[PDB]
Amino acid sequence: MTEYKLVVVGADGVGKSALTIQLIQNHFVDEYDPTIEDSYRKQVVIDGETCLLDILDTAGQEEYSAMRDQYMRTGEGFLCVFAINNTKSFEDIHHYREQIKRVKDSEDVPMVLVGNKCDLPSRTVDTKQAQDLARSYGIPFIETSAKTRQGVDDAFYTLVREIRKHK
């Protein structure tokens, strides 16, 4: 069985854990419990192929910024998550992408730009701006909601297709 090593990255509070928990447990976590580092091994069927997703739910807190190098080295694909109502989280994407590109020593790293909390009316980042940034990176962009499940399966499955399309 083919294994896919996925890493969920982004600023503290964007919904990395809620997106991961929504995908696996089909429920929305309203509580904010800062992550140190959690991992999940889940068997899924993507495009008729049964595969194992090894998902790493990382810390957004800058206090764990030294843990990054090792998980970026072993990670095969990166879900770069920002919140559509948090401008700093969108700006932080560039830093996460540059660090991934540095560690991996490649400009062609499987990545998906994720604009989470798309259920919220308090938007600060235009869809077109996020789309343009994803285009400058040459990566897909998906708007998601860990609450409604909108784009959640699509974000994770697109990332697997990116790793597969790269291999």
Ligand X SMILES: Nc1nc2c(ncn2[C@@H]2O[C@H](COP(=O)(O)OP(=O)(O)CP(=O)(O)O)[C@@H](O)[C@H]2O)c(=O)[nH]1
Q: Any idea of the CA torsion for 121, 32, 98, 110, to the nearest 10 degrees?
A: -80
Q: Which of 68/117 has CB closer to ligand R6W?
A: 68
Q: Are 41 and 3 in contact (CB under 8 A)?
A: no
Q: Is 35 in the site for Mg ion (CB under 5 A)?
A: yes
- Please calculate the CA angle 137-142-145 and round it to the nearest 5 degrees: 140
The partner in contact with residue 18, picked from ligand R6W, Mg ion, ligand X, none with C-beta cut-offs of 5 to 8 angstroms by kind, is ligand X
Q: How far is residue 92 CA from its own chain's centroid?
A: 13
Q: Is 70 in the site for ligand R6W (CB under 6 A)?
A: yes
Per rule CB under 6 A, count of chain residues that contact ligand R6W: 11
The partner in contact with residue 70, picked from Mg ion, ligand R6W, ligand X, none with C-beta cut-offs of 5 to 8 angstroms by kind, is ligand R6W
Compute the distance between CA of residue 136 and CA of residue 134 in angstroms, rounded to an integer: 6
- Kind and range of the H or E run holding 37: strand 37-46
Binding site for a copy of itself (CB under 8 A): 21, 24-27, 29, 31, 33, 35-43, 52
Binding site for ligand R6W (CB under 6 A): 5, 7, 37, 39, 54, 56, 67, 70-71, 74-75
